[PDB]
Each structure stands twice: as structure tokens, then as C-alpha cells.
């Protein structure tokens, strides 16, 4: 997986590739790794896929209840604190490595969190198997006072580096932009540089090609009247 976060002038952008794997096999070519914790707090996930989903949903559920209880819009530091304490308690066994970003009344924020429960602060971050390829691009092109357009460009370029150079990553680039005083914009399949070419041949079979022993109707309906 390749996931990144990049801060800019008036907010923060996160991005991710869309490949999930099972051994050396690609299980899903259009995986969604940008998870919504709350409307303006989103995070990118790497690691054990079930764990990242379960952990984002649990903390996202508890963040929603906390928001209703306090009559306040959720804060990124709260999502961070609740995620790290949960992951620390499980001593690394919950294999969730996350980049947590968002906007709240305090401002815009960008953090990373690792499976053992350590967190870090930064203006640019990368995680997953393609994090070295992505960090190379980030270390070469990042500057202070980036615009929205520049940060989206830099984030997607950093994912592309992971797509092309890391065998763990591939397919498409997903982006989510969180700007202060605006709705968060989730851009699913922001780039699509890996469409399969047309096949040489059609493999549609003639009807009757497969040998059958028995046919029967399956009753899916409930017990009937009369």
C-alpha cells in the first residue's frame, strides 16, 4: 500500500493507491483505503485490511457519540488519542498503520499512527510498503506554503511513485481534500492510469458447451397461501 498526507495553506490532503493483496495475488484492483472517521476527519489505511476497517469504524462510531454528547464538531486529536490508546492496549497485534488528517474548530491537522500505538506530527507523511518511493518524491518537491492545487499534485505524484515502483501498490489514485471552512471533497479514482487494454479474443462460449446432469428450480420464496 502507498498512503500519503500533505499539509497546505488552508487545509490538508490525503491520498492512497487502490490495490489490496493476498500473498502475491491482487485480490481487489479498486480498493478504497480512504476511510471517513467523521465528516471532516478522514484517514488513509495501510497494513492488515480487516484491522484498519474495524479500527476506523469503532473510533468513528465513538467519535460520533462523543460529538452528540458534547454538541461540538469532532477534533482530530480526539480521533488520534482514541486510536493510539486502543492500539497500544493490543500491543501491536491489531495491525493498523494509519495517516489521520482533518479540519476542526482548532484548525487543520496531519498525523500518522503505527500499530504499536506511537503517533507523529508532520507537514508531509507516508506509510505502507510504497512509503519509501512516496517519501522520495515528497522530500524532493515539498515546500512551505503550498497551495491546494500544488498539494493535490504533490500527493498524487507521491502515490504514483508507489504505484509504479512498489509491487505492493498499484492501479488508481484516491484523494480526499479537507479545507478549512468547507465541506471535505472525496475524489474517488482521481487518476486512472492503469486501464487494461482490449483482449485479442472473445472467450464467450457457444450455448450447450458445458455438460449438465440435473436441472431444478430453487424455491427462494416463503411458504405460500391457499
Amino acid at each position: 500500500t502507498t498512503i500519503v498526507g500533505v499539509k497546505f495553506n488552508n487545509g490538508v490532503v490525503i491520498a492512497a493507491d487502490t490495490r489490496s493483496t493476498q500473498g502475491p495475488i491482487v485480490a481487489d484492483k479498486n480498493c478504497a483505503k480512504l476511510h471517513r472517521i467523521s465528516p471532516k476527519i478522514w484517514c488513509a489505511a495501510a497494513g492488515t485490511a480487516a484491522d484498519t476497517e474495524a479500527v476506523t469504524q469503532l473510533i468513528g462510531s465513538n467519535i460520533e457519540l462523543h460529538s452528540l454528547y458534547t454538541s461540538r464538531e469532532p477534533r482530530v486529536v480526539s480521533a488520534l488519542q482514541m486510536l493510539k490508546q486502543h492500539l497500544f492496549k493490543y500491543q501491536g497485534h491489531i495491525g493498523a498503520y494509519l495517516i489521520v488528517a482533518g479540519v476542526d474548530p482548532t484548525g487543520s491537522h496531519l498525523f500518522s499512527i503505527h500499530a504499536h500505538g506511537s503517533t507523529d506530527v508532520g507537514y508531509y507523511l507516508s506509510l505502507g510498503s510504497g512509503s519509501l518511493a512516496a517519501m522520495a518524491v515528497l522530500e524532493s518537491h515539498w515546500k512551505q506554503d503550498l497551495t491546494k492545487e500544488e498539494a493535490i499534485k504533490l500527493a498524487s505524484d507521491a502515490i504514483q511513485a508507489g504505484i509504479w515502483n512498489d509491487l505492493g501498490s498499484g492501479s488508481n489514485v484516491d484523494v480526499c481534500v479537507m479545507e478549512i471552512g468547507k465541506d471535505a471533497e472525496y475524489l474517488r479514482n482521481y487518476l486512472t492510469p492503469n486501464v487494461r487494454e482490449e483482449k485479442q479474443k472473445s472467450y464467450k462460449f457457444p450455448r450447450g458447451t458445458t455438460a449438465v446432469l440435473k436441472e431444478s428450480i430453487v424455491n427462494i420464496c416463503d411458504i405460500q397461501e391457499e
Partner: protein, 250 residues
């Protein structure tokens, strides 16, 4: 430093009455009037913001509460009992439903869970029943719009329209005359404001009235864009200005 009250504090009397439930219903009768009306394309719930002092900021006290994005609740009776029930109702919507099925519960089942919590306070050791009646309005895909009442016993009933608390007998008669099965949501809001004016003594405006609807999806209130299936909350609390606009055409 022991909880020794492991026995029921609500029991059957010789006449077959459960005294504490009846007495809880009496507490609900003393409470401020609240109502609910169901339209074809929506549901409205409403109540009076009875301010305990003019120095108090009545905006901070929310009698009408969001439970899920498509479900809202109002009450009559004891306010603190209502507040803790709203906390528990919000939580049980997640724990016993959303964390299992990945979607919010339908209105009737969330009502069922709240009802269960209120029943248990009517039978468990060392507790009194909740001194509230709730009106829960909501929408879900397969059942459409709905409106439910929940009493201190745990019993619940679906309503086309109803009222609870202080002037409920008079308010229910008023609604019987005005309600029909072809009402639009705006017509139901208009009828809700007319019904509620009868039970209010003092000032009657957007600052002393609390009103919310279960209506169309509000994508502008969602807070994010990019997922076509997530179209926004159907619950919306009307503003002070929005209420006053409709009071001029009253």
C-alpha cells in the same frame, strides 16, 4: 458501601395496578406539551421551550434531539430522565445495530430498544421507572416515514398524529379534525404550530418554540462530497427565523 436493593421497587397491587408506572404517567401529565404529526412526504415533532429563568439561555437546553441522521425524539415529563435516555438511545443504535449491519436501524427497531430500556427500569432491582413519555419520529428505506410514542411501561404505539403531556387531551382532539392522509409536510408544520399555540400561555415565537422535521435528504448538511449513496440527514431542526416566517402566514 453495598447496593442491597436487588428486589423490585415496582410491584403489583391487589387491584392489578403497577403503582410506580401509573405515578410515572402522572409525572408525564404535569410535563410541558409536545406533539408529532406525520405527512405523506415527512414527519414533524414540536414542543414548548419552557424557560426556568429569563437569565437562562434556552438554546443550550435541547428538548428535540437527533438520535440518528434519519430519527429524532421529543418528550414530556422529567427532562433529566429524557437526557440520559437520549444518551443510551444513541449508543444502542450503534452497539446493537450499526456495528453489526453497517447501517442505521429502522425507526421501529430503535424504538423497540428504547422501549426495552424503559421496561427494565419497571422490573429490575432497586430502580424506579423513567418519568417520561417519548415521541420518536423517523424515516427508513423499507418502512418509509413513521411516528412512535413510548411510555414509562416500555409500551409503544405508532401514530398518524398525537400529543403528550399537559394539554394532550385538547391537542389530540384538534389533530383529529385537521389530519388527513393527503397532507404535505408544510401543511403538517402549519397544523403543528396551530395545535401548539393552544397549550402555550406566554410568548409564542421561534425563541420559545422548538420544532424539528424528518423530511427530504439534506446534502448541504452532510459536511462532505464524493459518495453518491450518502445523500445527507433527513432530520432537520428548524431555526428561530424559519419558525417566525411560518408564524406570519398563520
Amino acid at each position: 458501601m453495598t447496593d442491597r436493593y436487588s428486589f423490585s421497587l415496582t410491584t403489583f397491587s391487589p387491584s392489578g395496578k403497577l403503582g410506580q408506572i401509573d405515578y410515572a404517567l402522572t409525572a408525564v401529565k404535569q410535563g410541558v406539551t409536545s406533539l408529532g404529526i406525520k405527512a405523506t412526504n415527512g414527519v414533524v415533532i414540536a414542543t414548548e421551550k419552557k424557560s426556568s429563568s429569563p437569565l437562562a439561555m434556552s438554546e443550550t437546553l435541547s428538548k428535540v434531539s437527533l438520535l440518528t441522521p434519519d430519527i429524532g425524539a421529543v418528550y414530556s415529563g422529567m427532562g433529566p430522565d429524557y437526557r440520559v435516555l437520549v444518551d443510551k438511545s444513541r449508543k444502542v443504535a450503534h452497539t446493537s445495530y450499526k456495528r453489526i449491519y453497517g447501517e442505521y436501524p429502522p425507526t421501529k427497531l430503535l424504538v423497540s430498544e428504547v422501549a426495552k430500556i424503559m421496561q427494565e427500569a419497571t422490573q429490575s432491582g432497586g430502580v424506579r421507572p423513567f418519568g417520561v413519555s417519548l415521541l420518536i419520529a423517523g424515516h427508513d428505506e423499507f418502512n418509509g416515514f413513521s411516528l412512535y410514542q413510548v411510555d414509562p411501561s416500555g409500551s409503544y404505539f405508532p401514530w398518524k398524529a398525537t400529543a403528550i403531556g399537559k394539554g394532550s387531551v385538547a391537542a389530540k382532539t384538534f389533530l383529529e379534525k385537521r389530519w388527513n392522509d393527503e397532507l404535505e409536510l408544510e401543511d403538517a408544520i402549519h397544523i403543528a404550530l396551530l395545535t401548539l399555540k393552544e397549550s402555550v400561555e406566554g410568548e409564542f415565537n421561534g425563541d420559545t418554540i422548538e420544532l424539528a422535521i424528518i423530511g427530504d435528504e439534506n446534502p448541504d448538511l452532510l459536511g462532505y462530497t464524493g459518495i453518491p449513496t450518502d445523500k445527507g440527514p433527513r432530520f432537520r431542526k428548524l431555526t428561530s427565523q424559519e419558525i417566525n416566517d411560518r408564524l406570519e402566514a398563520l
